[PDB]
Tab-separated table of C-alpha atoms and ligand atoms in Angstrom:
chain	number	residue	atom	x	y	z
A	247	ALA	CA	-3.752	17.394	-20.503
A	248	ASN	CA	-3.326	21.065	-19.985
A	249	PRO	CA	-2.711	23.321	-16.734
A	250	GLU	CA	-6.204	24.248	-16.314
A	251	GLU	CA	-7.354	20.707	-16.716
A	252	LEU	CA	-4.850	19.338	-14.061
A	253	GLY	CA	-6.052	21.964	-11.561
A	254	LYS	CA	-9.844	21.137	-12.484
A	255	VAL	CA	-9.121	17.589	-11.605
A	256	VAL	CA	-7.641	18.417	-8.102
A	257	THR	CA	-10.509	20.682	-7.473
A	258	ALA	CA	-13.138	18.172	-8.649
A	259	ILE	CA	-11.629	15.496	-6.465
A	260	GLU	CA	-11.376	17.692	-3.328
A	261	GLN	CA	-14.941	18.800	-3.751
A	262	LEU	CA	-16.082	15.154	-3.998
A	263	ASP	CA	-13.999	14.440	-0.795
A	264	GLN	CA	-15.677	17.405	1.285
A	265	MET	CA	-19.073	16.206	-0.137
A	266	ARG	CA	-18.631	12.987	1.514
A	267	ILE	CA	-17.305	14.367	4.627
A	268	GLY	CA	-20.375	16.784	4.621
A	269	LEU	CA	-22.868	13.910	4.171
A	270	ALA	CA	-21.198	11.858	7.022
A	271	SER	CA	-20.898	14.849	9.346
A	272	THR	CA	-24.384	14.346	11.067
A	273	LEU	CA	-23.481	10.854	12.392
A	274	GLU	CA	-21.465	10.074	15.608
A	275	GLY	CA	-18.810	7.435	15.718
A	276	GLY	CA	-18.950	6.406	19.436
A	277	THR	CA	-22.625	5.207	18.929
A	278	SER	CA	-22.869	1.419	19.367
A	279	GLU	CA	-26.366	0.801	19.014
A	280	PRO	CA	-28.522	1.040	15.546
A	281	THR	CA	-29.890	4.256	14.569
A	282	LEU	CA	-32.137	5.330	11.806
A	283	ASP	CA	-29.648	8.131	10.569
A	284	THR	CA	-27.531	5.269	9.226
A	285	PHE	CA	-29.953	4.533	6.487
A	286	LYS	CA	-28.908	7.931	5.073
A	287	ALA	CA	-27.188	7.965	1.833
A	288	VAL	CA	-23.446	8.903	2.223
A	289	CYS	CA	-21.160	7.167	-0.023
A	290	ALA	CA	-23.426	6.033	-3.161
A	291	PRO	CA	-24.000	9.603	-4.284
A	292	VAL	CA	-20.106	9.978	-4.220
A	293	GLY	CA	-19.857	7.102	-6.693
A	294	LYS	CA	-22.566	8.623	-8.802
A	295	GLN	CA	-20.913	11.864	-8.840
A	296	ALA	CA	-17.647	10.252	-9.814
A	297	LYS	CA	-19.295	8.685	-12.763
A	298	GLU	CA	-20.813	11.958	-13.706
A	299	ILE	CA	-17.355	13.837	-13.543
A	300	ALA	CA	-15.715	11.116	-15.447
A	301	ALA	CA	-18.348	11.295	-18.408
A	302	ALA	CA	-18.671	15.040	-18.331
A	303	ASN	CA	-14.888	15.285	-18.659
A	304	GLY	CA	-13.658	12.398	-20.625
A	305	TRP	CA	-11.663	11.124	-17.559
A	306	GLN	CA	-11.776	7.851	-15.767
A	307	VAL	CA	-12.693	8.473	-12.144
A	308	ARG	CA	-13.060	5.748	-9.589
A	309	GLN	CA	-12.629	5.319	-5.825
A	310	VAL	CA	-10.277	2.322	-5.018
A	311	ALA	CA	-9.771	0.488	-1.882
A	312	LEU	CA	-7.990	-2.729	-0.675
A	313	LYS	CA	-11.031	-3.318	1.835
A	314	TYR	CA	-13.964	-2.328	-0.423
A	315	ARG	CA	-17.547	-2.583	-0.120
A	316	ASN	CA	-18.549	-2.131	-3.809
A	317	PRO	CA	-16.769	-4.507	-5.829
A	318	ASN	CA	-16.280	-1.893	-8.617
A	319	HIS	CA	-13.834	-0.273	-6.229
A	320	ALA	CA	-11.158	-3.221	-5.903
A	321	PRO	CA	-7.594	-2.425	-6.952
A	322	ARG	CA	-7.100	-3.488	-10.608
A	323	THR	CA	-3.650	-2.683	-11.671
A	324	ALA	CA	-0.108	-2.685	-10.423
A	325	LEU	CA	-0.496	1.184	-10.437
A	326	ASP	CA	-3.609	1.019	-7.945
A	327	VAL	CA	-1.433	-1.233	-5.772
A	328	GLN	CA	1.640	1.030	-5.952
A	329	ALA	CA	-0.491	4.162	-5.214
A	330	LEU	CA	-2.105	2.774	-2.175
A	331	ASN	CA	1.254	1.675	-1.011
A	332	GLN	CA	2.739	5.254	-1.469
A	333	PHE	CA	-0.202	6.466	0.791
A	334	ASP	CA	0.350	3.782	3.213
A	335	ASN	CA	3.971	4.276	3.679
A	336	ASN	CA	3.842	8.161	3.982
A	337	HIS	CA	0.884	9.382	6.217
A	338	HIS	CA	1.756	12.845	5.258
A	339	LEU	CA	1.245	12.175	1.426
A	340	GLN	CA	-2.174	13.612	0.474
A	341	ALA	CA	-2.059	13.245	-3.368
A	342	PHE	CA	0.307	12.620	-6.277
A	343	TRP	CA	0.102	12.590	-9.950
A	344	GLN	CA	2.111	10.295	-12.205
A	345	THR	CA	2.485	9.991	-15.984
A	346	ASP	CA	2.805	6.970	-18.100
A	347	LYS	CA	1.792	5.524	-21.665
A	348	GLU	CA	-1.874	5.556	-20.404
A	349	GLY	CA	-1.883	9.157	-19.629
A	350	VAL	CA	-1.988	11.431	-16.543
A	351	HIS	CA	-3.022	9.754	-13.280
A	352	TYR	CA	-4.146	11.545	-10.127
A	353	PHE	CA	-4.465	9.834	-6.865
A	354	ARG	CA	-5.861	11.353	-3.547
A	355	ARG	CA	-5.844	9.468	-0.280
A	356	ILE	CA	-8.942	9.009	1.751
A	357	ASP	CA	-8.619	8.719	5.450
A	358	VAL	CA	-11.026	7.378	8.267
A	359	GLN	CA	-12.785	9.964	10.309
A	360	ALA	CA	-14.963	9.231	13.442
A	361	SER	CA	-18.150	9.634	11.643
A	362	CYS	CA	-17.240	6.966	9.058
A	363	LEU	CA	-17.256	4.299	11.881
A	364	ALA	CA	-20.848	4.447	11.829
A	365	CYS	CA	-20.898	2.175	8.786
A	366	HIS	CA	-17.225	1.131	8.361
A	367	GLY	CA	-16.512	0.622	11.992
A	368	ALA	CA	-17.213	-2.694	13.942
A	369	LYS	CA	-18.230	-5.568	11.575
A	370	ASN	CA	-20.932	-6.510	13.898
A	371	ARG	CA	-22.230	-2.858	13.924
A	372	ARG	CA	-22.947	-2.481	10.273
A	373	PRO	CA	-26.493	-1.197	9.403
A	374	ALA	CA	-29.037	-3.660	8.365
A	375	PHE	CA	-29.228	-3.152	4.335
A	376	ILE	CA	-25.305	-3.120	3.975
A	377	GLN	CA	-24.633	-7.018	4.413
A	378	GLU	CA	-27.170	-8.052	1.869
A	379	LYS	CA	-26.671	-5.281	-0.672
A	380	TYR	CA	-22.811	-6.068	-0.167
A	381	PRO	CA	-22.366	-9.877	0.331
A	382	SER	CA	-18.592	-9.491	-0.236
A	383	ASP	CA	-18.053	-6.512	2.010
A	384	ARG	CA	-14.587	-5.750	3.502
A	385	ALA	CA	-15.096	-2.130	4.279
A	386	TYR	CA	-15.072	-2.535	8.168
A	387	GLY	CA	-12.881	-2.660	11.127
A	388	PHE	CA	-11.294	0.665	10.457
A	389	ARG	CA	-10.291	3.123	13.238
A	390	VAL	CA	-9.873	7.033	13.082
A	391	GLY	CA	-6.827	7.840	11.006
A	392	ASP	CA	-6.655	4.587	9.080
A	393	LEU	CA	-6.133	4.601	5.292
A	394	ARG	CA	-9.421	4.209	3.756
A	395	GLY	CA	-8.560	4.040	0.145
A	396	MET	CA	-8.210	6.607	-2.501
A	397	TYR	CA	-9.713	8.577	-5.460
A	398	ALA	CA	-8.069	7.643	-8.778
A	399	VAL	CA	-8.371	9.918	-11.725
A	400	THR	CA	-7.032	9.230	-15.361
A	401	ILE	CA	-6.640	11.815	-18.167
A	402	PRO	CA	-6.071	9.458	-21.117
A	403	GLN	CA	-3.195	9.722	-23.607
A	404	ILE	CA	-5.649	9.508	-26.557
A	405	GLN	CA	-8.696	11.742	-26.426
A	406	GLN	CA	-11.815	11.510	-28.584
A	407	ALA	CA	-11.798	15.330	-29.807
B	1981	LIG	C1	-23.318	4.592	6.169
B	1981	LIG	C2	-24.357	5.555	6.024
B	1981	LIG	C3	-21.850	5.189	5.930
B	1981	LIG	C4	-21.118	5.965	6.107
B	1981	LIG	C5	-21.353	6.933	7.495
B	1981	LIG	C6	-19.719	5.979	5.520
B	1981	LIG	N1	-19.825	5.096	4.520
B	1981	LIG	FE1	-18.413	4.905	2.950
B	1981	LIG	N2	-19.685	3.479	2.229
B	1981	LIG	C7	-20.960	3.131	2.591
B	1981	LIG	C8	-21.533	2.441	1.549
B	1981	LIG	C9	-23.079	1.715	1.458
B	1981	LIG	C10	-20.566	2.136	0.390
B	1981	LIG	C11	-20.799	1.487	-1.017
B	1981	LIG	C12	-21.215	2.632	-1.945
B	1981	LIG	C13	-21.348	2.339	-3.390
B	1981	LIG	O1	-20.519	2.835	-4.081
B	1981	LIG	O2	-21.949	1.256	-3.642
B	1981	LIG	C14	-19.422	2.784	0.832
B	1981	LIG	C15	-18.207	2.877	0.055
B	1981	LIG	C16	-17.149	3.692	0.399
B	1981	LIG	C17	-15.918	4.000	-0.413
B	1981	LIG	C18	-15.712	3.515	-1.861
B	1981	LIG	C19	-14.744	2.200	-1.955
B	1981	LIG	C20	-15.514	1.013	-1.364
B	1981	LIG	O3	-15.291	0.394	-0.362
B	1981	LIG	O4	-16.424	0.650	-2.137
B	1981	LIG	C21	-15.068	4.847	0.312
B	1981	LIG	C22	-13.595	5.378	-0.184
B	1981	LIG	C23	-15.585	5.216	1.637
B	1981	LIG	N3	-16.944	4.578	1.717
B	1981	LIG	C24	-15.264	5.970	2.555
B	1981	LIG	C25	-15.948	6.373	3.655
B	1981	LIG	C26	-15.590	7.572	4.595
B	1981	LIG	C27	-14.081	8.123	4.527
B	1981	LIG	C28	-16.380	7.853	5.400
B	1981	LIG	C29	-16.435	8.789	6.483
B	1981	LIG	C30	-16.270	10.386	6.084
B	1981	LIG	C31	-17.705	6.758	5.123
B	1981	LIG	N4	-17.191	6.002	3.994
B	1981	LIG	C32	-18.660	6.739	5.792
B	1981	LIG	C33	-21.413	3.368	3.666
B	1981	LIG	C34	-21.011	4.401	4.623
B	1982	LIG	CL1	-24.266	5.092	0.965
């Protein structure tokens, strides 16, 4: 890893975050009843873009949450749990990077805004397709200001070129 690369990671992640926020922005939170707008793609393109960034840069990039919708986003390592804990214990902590044998790891917290409650709010108010597409879903019951999860990036110690 080099200076430009570290900065590129911060920027890429922040752009991914602003992208999600942008897609969700058209939706209200206080709406109880079902609406067609909830069939809008909001978070799937975030995951797709994450894969694209990972592949284009030779990084690992992944969303991680204790309460996840997609099983690919579960915590996997002691570091995942440690990072989520750091975010949980310091609400002002937005992001951090850590180095170890595996390489350089950047984590950036994801918080819950009102719009998000359209699909991650009340369990009983989740849009139809969610439950059958995600049978083991846990990404509900959030309130505005909750810790949603985090982005996790690794710049591996050993590259390919
Ligand atoms: C319905 C249109 C949703 C809106 C509004 C929000 N989210 Fe979402 N989220 C939704 C789906 C269908 C998924 C799974 C996508 C996939 O990769 O298969 C998600 C997932 C996330 C994740 C990834 C971690 C996980 O639980 O799998 C995060 C971090 C996340 N959602 C956060 C999030 C935020 C902050 C939102 C408000 C800006 C938000 N989501 C809105 C459906 C919908
Ligand atoms: Cl989505």
